[PDB]
Amino acid sequence: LIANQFNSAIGKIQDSLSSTASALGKLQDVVNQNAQALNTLVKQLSSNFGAISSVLNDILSRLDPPEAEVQIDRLITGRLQSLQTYVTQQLIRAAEIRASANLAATKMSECVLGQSKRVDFCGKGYHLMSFPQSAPHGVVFLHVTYVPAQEKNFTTAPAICHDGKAHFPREGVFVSNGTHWFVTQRNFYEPQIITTDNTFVSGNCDVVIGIVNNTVYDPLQPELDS
Amino acid sequence: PVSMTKTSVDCTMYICGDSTECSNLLLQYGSFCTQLNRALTGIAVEQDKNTQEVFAQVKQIYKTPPIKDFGGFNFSQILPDPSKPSKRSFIEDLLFNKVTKFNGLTVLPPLLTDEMIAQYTSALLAGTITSGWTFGAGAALQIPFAMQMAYRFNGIGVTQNVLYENQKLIANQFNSAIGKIQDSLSSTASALGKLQDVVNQNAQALNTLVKQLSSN
Amino acid sequence: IRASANLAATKMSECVLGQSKRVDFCGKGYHLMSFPQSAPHGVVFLHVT
Amino acid sequence: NVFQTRAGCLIGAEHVNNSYECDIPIGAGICASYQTSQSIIAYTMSLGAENSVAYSNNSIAIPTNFTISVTTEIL
Ligand SMILES: *[C@@H]1O[C@H](CO)[C@@H](O[C@@H]2O[C@H](CO)[C@@H](O)[C@H](O)[C@H]2NC(C)=O)[C@H](O)[C@H]1NC(C)=O
Ligand SMILES: *[C@@H]1O[C@H](CO)[C@@H](O[C@@H]2O[C@H](CO)[C@@H](O)[C@H](O)[C@H]2NC(C)=O)[C@H](O)[C@H]1NC(C)=O
Ligand SMILES: *[C@@H]1O[C@H](CO)[C@@H](O[C@@H]2O[C@H](CO)[C@@H](O)[C@H](O)[C@H]2NC(C)=O)[C@H](O)[C@H]1NC(C)=O
Ligand SMILES: *[C@@H]1O[C@H](CO)[C@@H](O[C@@H]2O[C@H](CO)[C@@H](O)[C@H](O)[C@H]2NC(C)=O)[C@H](O)[C@H]1NC(C)=O
Ligand SMILES: *[C@@H]1O[C@H](CO)[C@@H](O)[C@H](O)[C@H]1NC(C)=O
Ligand SMILES: *[C@@H]1O[C@H](CO)[C@@H](O)[C@H](O)[C@H]1NC(C)=O
Ligand SMILES: *[C@@H]1O[C@H](CO)[C@@H](O)[C@H](O)[C@H]1NC(C)=O
């Protein structure tokens, strides 16, 4: 069953990626801002910056240097100011990416190279394993996760008295289907009979609150009797 | 800190106080201001994204059951209080009280009003008290708060029977500990320094911006 | 702020939604559970440890 | 067909009581969308389906099944 659930799950990822590009928004966004920034850079070249002409050669022509120097100087301050802005934008934008890269490294080191118990750090839900896929100027992860689907209501009790001694489950919790008391593992319904093996005794009945009477079967005794 | 004041400043209104002559000169500089207006937009929309990521991490809005029977623990302080007009818990308001133009400067409103944020923190808090960590994984699963705490001990390596034997003592230690939180926030404002520092820097940033108008 | 926002975002997911075994990522001491509370332009956590 | 909000004056969008998932953000809690005969509607945001949990002091819900779901994370 799990193989089929895993194989189909990969199948949908194709279709979501095949038809809709809304997933790839984040990488495409990086391209636009950088590409758009350059368009602003070259655009500033055509701007006059308060001089007679934006084309530098037309200033070299159309008048001799001693006056033309004043016109060029006005051009330089405008152009130089454009770089100051454009570079300063990159450094700040470059810092954003580098912060994202370090997050990717941590996410790669801690998701694909190993299981991660950090909640919601590697995909929604309980995490099993992760696959990296390269993408233009980026990385795409497939987080394979375990999500508990169908649940039931069971009456529960913190502990069980058997002979005046409180019993606590070694692992999992006590659940009753209404008439019988079982211990089942935490994240899956696998009911199984109470034994001294599942339960470790501690203390006395009175202190615990909500403790319920029941019987604790002991494996050894029938073996002894038979 | 999570978000800062979403401000947008107009190109021309700041630079030229509605002079066409001043405006025409500005067109020579080309596309400077339109990237400034655009850069400040990039910041602005980002903040509404921040508050999404911090709070909008729960797919459904859980609410606590009416009767507050939580094995002795007392979340009346942190749980929402209906009597107060904004659906805010008591400790939240101690926060909202402790923490405290016309030249093209506009302050855009945040997308999530302080009411709606209070519903997430009510939802997240309601989820933790009835379902433990489960609502993060998938459908939230009810589990008695006595046991969920007993799980949490078992997480840090203390066996379960420590809690159930000492439930009463833990409850008072937890209830009293909440009590000290109110007083530390109610009396001492040094706690909220970081949020207050964010606000002061921004207000101080705008004032310096406006002061620059009146210099030769 | 964005760096602070994500740090809250991570701390929200790994500390409120679940118990976290990272040390001092969730207040001093062994961590049990944490509660979120809203605040002006920020979030305040209670760390039950 | 004018609607007044804290964001500003909103012209050409019809107010509705019904709430939905935020589609196009206006701010201060109103998001606008295209919906049915189709037009533009502006509505208060819906923060998600309301879901109270059937809590009690002796009731626990155990999953009986699982789904292996693979998700995509892009950086
Ligand atoms: C709860 O589970 C127990 C264990 O499976 C059920 O007890 C069994 O019931 C079947 C009939 O369905 C009998 O054939 C078995 O002999 C019973 N086992 C024992 C040890 O008595 C019980 O019926 C279930 N009850 C509910 C309400 O779910
Ligand atoms: C669990 O069973 C025990 C008996 O083994 C019950 O203890 C009895 O409690 C009543 C009420 O105080 C006393 O009158 C009896 O004398 C007790 N029996 C003995 C042998 O001392 C206990 O009440 C039961 N608890 C539950 C929750 O069923
Ligand atoms: C949880 O604690 C609050 C106190 O923070 C309790 O509310 C108080 O209840 C007493 C009655 O026992 C009143 O006299 C006080 O005026 C209440 N204080 C406030 C601020 O309302 C509440 O009863 C406790 N809940 C439980 C179940 O014990
Ligand atoms: C656990 O859930 C899975 C979810 O698929 C169930 O598997 C389906 O079972 C039906 C039977 O009616 C089949 O028709 C489907 O093809 C199965 N799905 C897949 C993906 O194989 C499974 O039956 C459930 N188990 C229990 C015990 O309820
Ligand atoms: C558990 O009981 C509650 C009682 O209100 C019910 O609403 C819920 O649907 C039950 N769980 C399931 C899985 O049916
Ligand atoms: C559980 O709550 C019920 C009220 O619905 C009460 O009668 C009972 O004593 C409580 N049991 C425990 C163990 O708290
Ligand atoms: C919302 O409902 C009220 C009554 O419940 C009604 O009077 C009002 O007209 C409705 N709003 C719209 C936009 O139809």
The protein residue whose alpha carbon is closest to atom 10 in ligand 5 is A153
Q: How far apart are CA D4 and CA B135, in angstroms?
A: 38
- B1–C contact, CB cutoff 8 A: yes
Enter the resolution in angstroms: 3.4
Q: Which two tokens stand for residue A132?
A: 């990296």
Residue of D9, D13, D8, D33 whose CA lies nearest to D22: D33
**B80-83: long-range contacts, CB 8 A cutoff, minimum separation 24:** B80/B118, B80/B122
Rounded Cα distance between B33 and B43, Å, is 15
Pick from B39, B133, B141: which is nearest to A151 by CB?
A: B141
- Asked whether A and B share 3 or more beta-carbon pairs under 8 angstroms, the answer is yes
φ, ψ dihedrals at B131, nearest 5°: -130, 0
Q: How far apart are CA A215 and CA A144, in angstroms?
A: 41
Q: Which residues contact B1 (CB under 8 A, 6 or more apart)?
A: B194, B195, B198, C1, C4, C5, C41, C42
How far apart, in whole angstroms, are the C-alpha atoms of residue C5 and residue C15? 15
Backbone Cα Rg of chain D:
19
Cβ-based neighbours of B108, under 8 Å, separated by 6 or more: B6, B7, B8, B44, D27
Alpha helices in A108-162 (DSSP H): none
SS3 content of chain D, % helix, strand, coil (to 5): 0, 55, 45
Tell me how far apart the alpha carbons of residues C34 and B128 are, in angstroms, rounded to a whole number: 9
Q: Is D34 exposed, middle or buried (0-12, 13-18, 19+ CB in 10 A)?
A: exposed
Q: Give distance in angstroms: CA of A178 to centre of ligand 1.
A: 10
Tell how strand B7-9 and strand A181-184 pair up.
unpaired
Handedness of CA B93, B97, B99, B102 (dihedral sign): positive
Give the closest-approach CA distance of B127 to chain C in angstroms: 8
Report whether C41 contacts B2 (CB < 8 A). Answer: yes
Residues with CB under 6 A from ligand 5: A 151-153; D 54
C chain contacts of residue A119, beta-carbon cutoff 8 Å = 13-14, 17-18, 20
Ligand 3 pocket check for B77: Cβ under 6 Å: yes
Pairing of strands A138-148, A126-135: antiparallel
DSSP state of B146: H
SS3 (DSSP) at A85: helix
Token pair listed for B211: 């002061």
Q: Are D32 and D16 in contact, with CB atoms under 8 Å apart?
A: no
CB A226 within 8 A of CB A213: no
**Cα B38 to Cα A1: distance, rounded to the nearest angstrom:** 52
3-state secondary structure C7-47: HHHHHHHHHHHCCCCCCECCECCCCCEEEEEEECCEEEEEE
Quote the tokens at residue B196: 């207050």
**Alpha carbons A38 and A87: distance in angstroms, whole number:** 11
Experimental method: cryo-EM
Report whether residue A4 contacts ligand 4, using a CB cutoff of 6 Å: yes
> From the CB coordinates, do chains C and B have 3 or more pairs under 8 Å?
yes
In the chain, the amino acid numbered B9 is V
D67 contacts on A by Cβ (under 8 Å): 5, 147, 149
Dihedral angle at the C-alpha atoms of B59, B64, B66, B69, nearest 10 degrees? Answer: 150
